[PDB]
Design a protein around this ligand. Structure first.
Ligand SMILES: CCCCCCCCCCCCCCCCCC(=O)OC[C@H](COP(=O)([O-])OCC(O)COP(=O)([O-])OC[C@@H](COC(=O)CCCCCCCCCCCCCCCCC)OC(=O)CCCCCCCCCCCCCCCCC)OC(=O)CCCCCCCCCCCCCCCCC
Ligand SMILES: CCCCCCCCCCCCCCCCCC(=O)OC[C@H](COP(=O)([O-])OCC(O)COP(=O)([O-])OC[C@@H](COC(=O)CCCCCCCCCCCCCCCCC)OC(=O)CCCCCCCCCCCCCCCCC)OC(=O)CCCCCCCCCCCCCCCCC
Ligand SMILES: CCCCCCCCCCCCCCCCCC(=O)OC[C@H](COP(=O)([O-])OCC(O)COP(=O)([O-])OC[C@@H](COC(=O)CCCCCCCCCCCCCCCCC)OC(=O)CCCCCCCCCCCCCCCCC)OC(=O)CCCCCCCCCCCCCCCCC
Ligand SMILES: CCCCCCCCCCCCCCCCCC(=O)OC[C@H](COP(=O)([O-])OCC(O)COP(=O)([O-])OC[C@@H](COC(=O)CCCCCCCCCCCCCCCCC)OC(=O)CCCCCCCCCCCCCCCCC)OC(=O)CCCCCCCCCCCCCCCCC
Ligand SMILES: CCCCCCCCCCCCCCCCCC(=O)OC[C@H](COP(=O)([O-])OCC[N+](C)(C)C)OC(=O)CCCCCCCCCCCCCCCCC
Ligand SMILES: CCCCCCCCCCCCCCCCCC(=O)OC[C@H](COP(=O)([O-])OCC[N+](C)(C)C)OC(=O)CCCCCCCCCCCCCCCCC
Ligand SMILES: CCCCCCCCCCCCCCCCCC(=O)OC[C@H](COP(=O)(O)OCCN)OC(=O)CCCCCCCCCCCCCCCCC
Ligand SMILES: CCCCCCCCCCCCCCCCCC(=O)OC[C@H](COP(=O)(O)OCCN)OC(=O)CCCCCCCCCCCCCCCCC
Ligand SMILES: [Zn+2]
Lengths: 168, 54, 89, 132, 175, 178, 124, 231, 101, 67, 109
């Protein structure tokens, strides 16, 4: 139900961007939003199917009584990190966010930055905390820091204020 | 623009990864916090209600 | 967190014991051909009442031992202290 | 619990902590993982027996918790790796007090089956510390 | 029912306890559990789920307790600075206070760090320290409202027990 | 499928995959028939090129019905087309085929863009007027409309009742060997 | 299936074992089967009823207060509102001022009474 | 249908079962009292030695050349357009030569065969000498194949498509690890099989198996959680 | 809940949704409202029976599928494993004990 | 409600959770365990009968089943 | 396929038919000659004439199905009774109306 509730959030967002935005460029921006967010959701879905099939259970508690090997743990952590970083925009995947903020209506932009991206932080946290991972987090830390550096270095050359807020 | 500056910008993530690796070497011998997903709460969440029914 | 946690299994190398006899009696099926050849050589040499001193079962046994230790030796070393690979390579 | 009483203390109840050996923790964890089926059955057996003759008018009210005894034996054997005895009554002189504590906390005081595991684990720990 | 994932690497497994030989690539769900998933993931795997929850909470409280020790010694240093002039502060502070400041430094006390790197024995020792403090304060009933929740009926029994214990301690001879 | 003292214990159904395939086929047929009913309501001569998806922008029922049919075909989570793909990935993971999962993922993402590309073509300057005329007035069919209503209900909320369909399909598939 | 009381006799087992496998008194067994070793089903039912009543009262008072506030302060611009209030008779002005505050404050007071345990009998 | 069947053999299981071994010595030993001709003919065991580096390199080059020839025959030549003057000259050459088709075929297929031979030889020398001792087999395969295919795409095809060469190398390495290194759909044993070696009697093994079943009963969620109703 | 009432509610909302989708007014052709509830109530009521009765036969089918899986596993053993001590006793049980016909 | 009254778990979880598992185990686990426990209950009964004669049998000793 | 006795039993020679009446009469007679003496393992030699009639009347596939069904029935009878099965079914259908809660902070494992 956790994964299903995370997945349920896409259709209203796409509908709002498609039917309520006044700008003409918002038609393609909604498609970009959908395609990136759904690629991330597909990665998360692969990880969830892995966990469900290996451990025939749906409770966070039962994971305390099952151990994942090194290979499965590495696969799961990579999949969940990349999938939730598609929505909570990590460095190489923020083109959709920039386009969607530039073209979307102001209220939905407030909702998207203020709350929607946070939905990726929560779920990741849960799946990060329920599994024992024996990998070095240096690669993920480097990806996040590259995101910070790349976003903050691009703020000077912005004339549109909404794009500047998106980069922040 | 500048070829050297563009190359430096391109190779930034590798530089960050290498610096993190070096400081992980420093943390390993000093027994500092390593760059790992720590597992000390056994999956119990931060402030989570753990109650039973019946 | 691993490393600061108790170990679930204690191997007999970690108990200061030699598993070489077990590994030898488990690597023997890998070299049944050489073992059979050595047995045939021994049977042939037994039958001859007079044989040249140059003739011996030494070389079939050398081949059989080579195969058995090819199976045996690396896996015992791989569990020892100081035989771990490098950080990257 | 892993506290030992302090002898010749100035006040009455002063304790000092200690940490078990890595072998003891490993042994207890492995036996608990491999013998948890009996532990769950004791909880179910204990509740089931009272449901059938909780009243004093029942025909077999005198027997009490006797059948669950069999489970209590099996768990013990499992936790002892069959190296000491077939029944808990054959436990060595060490850990005998902890067995009495477990029996009091399991049947005489029908406590939740959370505290009772501590006393059985104490029996196992005492046996492990004594023997080898 | 727990399952498993099919393995790929080809390597022999020797079970001397059961006296069998298996292959990693030909392990079913149950054999994978007892041969590949048997490692521990806790500081104290010998404790139950409830017991390890109590252990984890006590460990968190113990880290906060050591942080409180450092905060208290810092506040004592501030009080000494205000109350004592610099003409003699250094020597007095060098008496018994500098050693305690250095005893509660970065490795011994977590401080503002993300994680305190402790082995399972260190965690056990911290939990034992916290439990020793608890046993000291529980026998006097000092933890009713601040660190406890008793009913009205239990309060009277606790008061009687503490009164009897205080009477017993008073009538003993001095050491 | 383990053995203890010559007693065999199995926790695998061995017929789940056939039921999953049947579910995928049936779900695809249902969504396809929804979109073709939407097409059959209208004047058929208008839909020749891909840009003419704009012709579906006539009134709210047709427009939204086809938007949701396209999203279901693309595999969007809430709708019916997502369940078959999700269960296919679950069964592949259960069978331990990560390469098949990767190739299905590539196919799924490319096909999803292939489907949602046409949502851009639906934008039209004015109402399309794609209805046949009869007795001087547009001919709006009620029976096909009700069929689309039922198909829309089961597209929106089919994930709630999917357990019964899975039960029936596994019951059918259990006869394959017996 | 094999855990039963058929073919079970006190002759086989020694007295001490029986002494450690005998039932406790009637009260302990009743508390065990009723699962009332610490709290009673009456306690639980009373707590559920109190929670129901508290939620319904809080929600109703909050909605009433916000509706009356909105519908009393959403009649026009500042001058229009001032004219309407001036035209209102004194009891009407008193009501449209006081009663939203009464509803919201009573909701907050009920919540505060919910979070405070002042019924404890170990005082003095 | 099997791939790399010789390298995936479980030697211990094969020896225990008595199955023929693919690593057995497949060699010929001439003996005395034999003619001089059979001495020379028995030297053909050289071509059967899979530990010969030159033979392995030549076989890899032959396989690469055969693959290149097949690709040219099926997809390469027919796609390319030949000038009409060159085609007319070729057909005139066929008219004045008894087997002129063979010469045309040689001229058309020489570049593809040569490129395939070189690629196969270089690939074998690159895999066998560099990446054969890496601990992580999957990562080694992925990295080596990605780099090799990127270089091959840069050289043989336009160098501006090297990224797609890297992606194709990654995918090929994943596929190779899944089916050429691992054994899926091609298994020589049964899942869960084992071999016993101790002197334990049947009673001891049965007791251990009863213990194992008791432990296995804890893997059921309903059993472990105590959520079973009374039957 | 009751399936008959759930079906009747389903038909009531289905008719109203169909009226809205066709842009025809509600309150039009009123006799279709009771007909839809009656048809939908009977339809879902029968499906409730059919789904329950499919579970029963599915469970009984798995008992026969239990026997097929064991015999399929033994017949799919690699050659030489039949007389191996890992499978020798189980194989002999089906070849000898199950020859009772 | 009426749709989800066959199992104590919601229908979505039933759909996407029990991949490849037996419906017997999912819906009636007690009968599933009892059926797979056959020839072990008989062995346990024989063990109890022998124990009534004062003899202890080391094999089949772990076979103590409560479900 | 290739592993199921059910599908192999449906394979027959051309021009081969089954007389179900005679086969079932013989099987009923043989199973009533049995089931009067009860054994854990059925011994057909204790009912020789009915055994011979059963062998000469029913096909091999029918006899295999009959033995499999008889073994399953004998296994089921030793474990279950009508009343306890009814009680268990009623209890399961009654608890199906409720929900399942996690067992937080367990003790067994
Ligand atoms: C769990 C939630 C899953 C949601 C899945 C989803 O995305 O559903 C799409 C669906 C989109 O409905 P819509 O945007 O109103 O569609 C307008 C019609 O296409 C066009 O509306 P119309 O004015 O042309 O009238 C026709 C419309 C009239 O009916 C409705 O408008 C009812 C819509 C809600 C049901 O009926 C239908 O579209 C078919 C109704 C079939 C069921 C009837 C009972 O969203 C929901 O149903 C929202 C569910 C919210 C649940 C919150 C908890
Ligand atoms: C049985 C008893 C049970 C209860 C017991 C007690 C329980 C108590 C529990 C606690 C209760 C707390 C209160 C609960 C909520 C309900 C209160 C309520 O309804 O009161 C109004 C209600 C009547 O209100 P009203 O006369 O109708 O006027 C309100 C109109 O709706 C609107 O009037 P208007 O539109 O005609 O006039 C506008 C005026 C009306 O005043 C208001 O509307 C006040 C609320 C304004 C909110 C926003 C103000 C700014 C906030 C800034 C925050 C910091 C920002 C920077 C942070 C760094 O607004 C102002 O004057 C604005 C204030 C000035 C702002 C200047 C800001 C400058 C910039 C600052 C930042 C610079 C840096 C950046 O009170 C009563 O009826 C009292 C009844 C007393 C009964 C006694 C017994 C008989
Ligand atoms: C190889 C041995 C051999 O004779 O190779 C000569 C053959 C062609 O000889 P050439 O010197 O080009 O003769 C040209 C003709 O005088 C004049 O050229 P053309 O246009 O009359 O036809 C040339 C060629 C045209 O080549 C083809 O039609 C190739 C095959 C097409 C597919 C159908 C299979 C062949 C069916 C008939 C032959 C069955 C043989 C078994 O057909 C032939 O030479 C007939 C025999 C083909 C055997 C392959 O070379 C190859 O096949 C290479
Ligand atoms: C959850 C998963 C499981 C779901 C299970 C249920 C599925 C079906 C759900 C819909 C049915 C219940 C709601 C009914 C609503 C209503 O009030 O309708 C009245 C409404 C009456 O319209 P009207 O305008 O008042 O009538 C005047 C007209 O001029 C038209 O009049 P006419 O001159 O054309 O002739 C009169 C005729 C007009 O109506 C018809 O002719 C209907 C024909 C529809 C196709 C049926 C194919 C099979 C027909 C029967 C085959 C022979 C059986 C033996 C018969 C006796 C032989 C001697 O009859 C009527 O008007 C009264 C209805 C009598 C037939 C009702 C049949 C219901 C069958 C429901 C189950 C179908 C699937 C079963 C699968 C297996 C289940 C174990 O019915 C219709 O318009 C047709 C309804 C068709 C219902 C069945 C197909 C629905 C498919 C929806 C999409 C589902 C996709 C996703 C499924 C899986 C999701 C996970
Ligand atoms: C990128 C691609 C290039 C990577 C670097 C080069 C790799 C190969 C370098 C040469 C290897 C070599 O000579 O190996 C010795 C081996 C020796 O093999 P050999 O056949 O002479 O001897 C038998 C094998 N040993 C040594 C174990 C007894 O190969 C050669 O000498 C010839 C190899 C090329 C044949 C054509
Ligand atoms: C019985 C049919 C119930 C559904 C139809 C319905 O009541 O539609 C609302 C219709 C009105 O919708 P309508 O679609 O007929 O009218 C168009 C909309 N207005 C009203 C704005 C002009 O009836 C009512 O609202 C009256 C109450 C129901 C009367 C019958 C009860 C039985
Ligand atoms: C996008 C779609 C992704 C679909 C999921 C599959 C992705 C590739 C998985 C490859 C894989 O599982 O390889 C198996 C291999 C097993 O490694 P093994 O040798 O058993 O143990 C590690 C110690 N060397 O595994 C490994 O060696 C490590 C596997 C994880 C590598 C990092 C994550 C890669 C992306 C996922
Ligand atoms: C489709 C799916 C099939 C199933 C999944 C598995 C896919 C991969 C299977 C093959 C793996 C492979 O290539 O392995 C490399 C192989 C190793 O060989 P090895 O066993 O070590 O030694 C035997 C003797 N050499 O060594 C070789 O095969 C040697 C040659 C490898 C390199 C070939 C390079 C390309 C050759 C064809 C080129 C075609 C185009 C040429 C012209 C271009 C334009 C001019
Ligand atoms: Zn061996």
């Amino acid at each position: 139900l956790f994964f299903m509730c995370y997945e349920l959030l896409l259709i209203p967002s796409f509908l709002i961007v498609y039917f309520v935005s006044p700008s003409r460029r918002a038609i393609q921006a909604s498609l970009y939003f959908v395609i990136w967010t759904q690629l991330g959701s597909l990665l998360v879905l692969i990880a969830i199917s892995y966990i469900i099939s290996i451990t025939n259970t749906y409770e966070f508690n039962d994971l305390k009584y099952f151990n994942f090997t090194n290979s499965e743990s590495t696969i799961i952590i990579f999949l969940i990190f990349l999938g939730f970083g598609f929505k909570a925009p990590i460095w190489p995947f923020h083109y959709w966010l920039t386009k969607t903020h530039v073209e979307a209506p102001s209220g939905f932009s407030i909702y998207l930055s203020g709350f929607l991206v946070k939905t990726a932080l929560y779920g990741f946290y849960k799946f990060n905390t329920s599994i024992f991972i024996d990998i070095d987090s240096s690669i993920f830390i480097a990806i996040c820091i590259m995101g910070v550096v790349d976003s903050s270095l691009k703020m000077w050359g912005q004339t549109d204020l909404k794009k500047l807020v998106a980069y922040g | 623009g500048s070829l050297a500056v563009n190359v430096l910008f391109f190779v930034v993530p590798l530089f960050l990864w290498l610096i993190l690796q070096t400081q992980s070497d420093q943390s390993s011998n000093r027994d500092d916090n390593s760059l790992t997903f720590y597992f000390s709460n056994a999956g119990f969440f931060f402030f989570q209600i753990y109650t039973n029914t019946g | 967190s691993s490393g600061d946690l108790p170990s679930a299994t204690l191997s007999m190398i970690q108990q200061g014991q030699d598993p070489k006899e077990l590994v030898l009696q488990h690597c023997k099926p890998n070299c049944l051909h050489w073992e059979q050849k050595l047995k045939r050589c021994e049977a042939k040499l037994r039958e001859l009442v007079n044989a040249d001193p140059e003739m011996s079962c030494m070389y079939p046994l050398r081949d059989w031992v080579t195969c058995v230790e090819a199976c045996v030796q690396p896996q015992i070393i791989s569990q020892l202290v100081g035989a771990q690979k490098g950080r990257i390579w | 619990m892993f506290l030992n009483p302090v002898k010749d203390s100035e006040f009455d109840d002063e304790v000092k902590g200690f940490v078990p050996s890595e072998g003891e923790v490993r042994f207890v964890a492995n036996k608990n993982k491999e013998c948890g089926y009996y532990l769950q059955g004791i909880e179910q057996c204990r509740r089931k027996m009272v449901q059938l003759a909780g009243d004093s008018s029942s025909q077999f009210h005198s027997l009490g918790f006797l059948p669950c005894k069999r489970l209590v034996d099996a768990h013990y054997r499992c936790m002892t790796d069959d190296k000491f005895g077939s029944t808990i009554e054959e436990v060595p002189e060490i850990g005998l007090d902890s067995a009495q504590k477990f029996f009091d906390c399991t049947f005489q005081q029908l406590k939740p089956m959370q505290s009772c595991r501590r006393f059985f684990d104490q029996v196992v720990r005492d046996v492990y510390r004594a023997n080898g | 029912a727990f399952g498993g994932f099919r393995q790929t690497d080809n390597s022999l497994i020797i079970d001397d306890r059961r006296k069998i030989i298996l292959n990693t690539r030909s392990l079913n769900d149950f054999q994978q559990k007892i041969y590949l998933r048997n490692f521990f993931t806790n500081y104290r795997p010998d404790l139950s789920s409830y017991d390890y929850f109590a252990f984890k909470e006590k460990l968190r409280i113990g880290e906060l307790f050591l942080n409180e020790y450092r905060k208290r010694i810092n506040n004592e240093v501030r009080r000494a600075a205000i109350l004592t002039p610099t003409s003699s502060l250094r020597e007095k502070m060098n008496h018994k206070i500098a050693d305690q400041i250095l005893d509660l430094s970065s490795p011994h006390v977590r401080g503002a760090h993300f994680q305190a790197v402790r082995s399972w024995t260190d965690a056990s020792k911290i939990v034992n320290y916290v439990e020793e403090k608890q046993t000291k304060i529980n026998k006097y009933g000092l933890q009713f409202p601040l660190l406890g929740n008793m009913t009205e009926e239990q309060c009277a029994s606790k008061e009687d027990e503490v009164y009897q214990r205080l009477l017993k301690e008073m009538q003993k001879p001095p050491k | 499928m383990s053995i203890f003292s010559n007693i065999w214990i199995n926790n695998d159904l061995n017929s789940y995959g056939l039921s999953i395939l049947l579910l995928n086929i049936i779900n695809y047929l249902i969504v396809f028939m929804l979109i073709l009913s939407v097409i059959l309501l209208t004047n058929l001569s208008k839909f020749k090129s891909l840009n003419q998806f704009k012709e579906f922008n006539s009134y709210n029922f047709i427009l939204y019905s086809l938007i949701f049919s396209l999203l279901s075909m693309a595999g969007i989570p809430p709708l019916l087309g997502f369940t078959g793909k999700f269960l296919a990935i679950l069964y592949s993971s259960f069978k331990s085929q990560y390469l098949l999962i990767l190739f299905m993922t590539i196919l799924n993402i490319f096909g999803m863009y292939f489907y949602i590309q046409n949502l851009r073509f639906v934008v039209k300057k004015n109402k399309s007027s794609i209805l046949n005329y009869k007795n001087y007035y547009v001919n709006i069919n009620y029976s096909i409309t009700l069929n689309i209503i039922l198909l829309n209900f089961f597209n929106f909320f089919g994930i709630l009742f999917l357990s019964d369909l899975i039960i029936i399909l596994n019951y059918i598939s259990s006869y394959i060997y017996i | 299936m094999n855990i039963a009381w058929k073919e079970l006799e006190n002759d086989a087992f020694k007295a001490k074992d029986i002494a450690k496998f005998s039932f406790s008194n009637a009260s302990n067994l009743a508390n065990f089967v009723a699962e009332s070793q610490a709290l009673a089903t009456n306690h639980f039912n009373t707590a559920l009823n109190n929670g129901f009543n508290v939620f319904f009262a809080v929600a109703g008072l909050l909605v009433v207060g916000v509706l009356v506030y909105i519908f009393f302060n959403s009649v026009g611009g500042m001058i229009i509102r001032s004219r309407i209030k001036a035209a209102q008779p004194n009891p009407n002005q008193v009501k449209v001022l006081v009663m939203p505050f009464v509803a919201l404050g009573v909701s907050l007071v009920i919540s505060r009474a919910g979070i405070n345990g002042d019924d404890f009998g170990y005082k003095g | 249908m099997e791939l790399n069947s010789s390298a995936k053999e479980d030697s211990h299981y094969v020896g225990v079962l008595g199955y023929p071994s693919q690593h057995d010595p497949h060699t010929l030993h001439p003996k005395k009292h034999d003619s001089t001709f059979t001495k020379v003919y028995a030297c053909r065991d050289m071509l059967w030695d899979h530990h010969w580096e030159v033979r392995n390199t030549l076989y890899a080059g032959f396989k690469g050349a055969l693959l290149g020839v097949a690709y040219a025959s099926g997809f390469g030549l027919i796609s390319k357009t030949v000038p009409s003057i060159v085609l007319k000259k070729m057909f005139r050459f066929v008219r004045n030569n008894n087997f002129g088709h063979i010469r045309i075929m040689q001229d058309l297929l020489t570049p593809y065969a040569l490129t395939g031979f070189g690629l196969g030889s270089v690939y074998y020398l690159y895999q066998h000498n560099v990446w054969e001792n890496r601990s992580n087999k999957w990562l080694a395969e992925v990295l080596s194949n990605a780099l090799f295919f990127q270089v091959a795409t840069a050289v043989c095809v336009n160098p501006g498509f090297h990224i797609y060469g890297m992606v194709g190398g990654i995918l090929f390495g994943t596929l190779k690890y899944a089916f050429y290194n691992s054994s899926f759909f091609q298994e020589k044993e049964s899942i869960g099989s084992y071999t016993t070696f101790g002197d334990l009697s049947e009673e001891e093994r049965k007791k251990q198996e009863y213990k194992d079943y008791i432990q296995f009963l804890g893997n059921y969620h309903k059993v472990r959680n105590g959520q079973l109703v009374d039957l | 809940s009751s399936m008959l009432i759930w079906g009747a509610c389903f038909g009531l909302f289905t008719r109203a949704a169909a009226c809205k989708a066709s842009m025809i007014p509600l309150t039009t052709s009123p006799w279709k409202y009771p007909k839809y509830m009656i048809v939908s109530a009977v339809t879902f009521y029968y499906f409730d029976w059919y789904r329950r009765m499919a579970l029963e036969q599915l469970c009984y089918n798995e008992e026969k599928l239990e026997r097929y899986q064991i015999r399929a596993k033994l017949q799919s053993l690699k050659i030489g494993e039949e007389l191996s001590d890992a499978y020798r006793e189980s194989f002999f049980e089906h070849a000898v004990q199950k020859n009772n016909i | 409600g009426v749709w989800s009254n066959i199992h104590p778990t919601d229908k979505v979880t039933l759909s996407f959770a029990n991949i490849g598992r037996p419906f017997r185990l999912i819906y009636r686990p007690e009968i599933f365990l009892r059926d797979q426990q056959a020839k072990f209950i008989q062995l346990e009964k024989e063990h109890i009968e022998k124990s009534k004669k004062g003899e202890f049998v080391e094999t089949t000793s772990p076979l103590v089943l409560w479900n | 396929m290739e592993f199921s006795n059910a599908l192999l039993s449906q394979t027959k020679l051309p021009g081969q038919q089954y007389d179900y009446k005679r086969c079932f009469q013989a099987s009923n007679t043989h199973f009533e000659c049995l089931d009067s003496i009860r054994d854990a393992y059925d011994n057909h030699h204790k009912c020789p004439q009915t055994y011979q009639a059963w062998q000469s009347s029913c096909d091999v596939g029918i006899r295999r199905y009959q033995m499999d069904n008889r073994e399953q029935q004998k296994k089921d009878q030793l474990l279950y009774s009508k009343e306890q099965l009814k009680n268990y079914n009623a209890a399961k259908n009654k608890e199906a109306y409720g929900i399942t809660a996690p067992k937080n902070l367990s003790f067994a494992f």
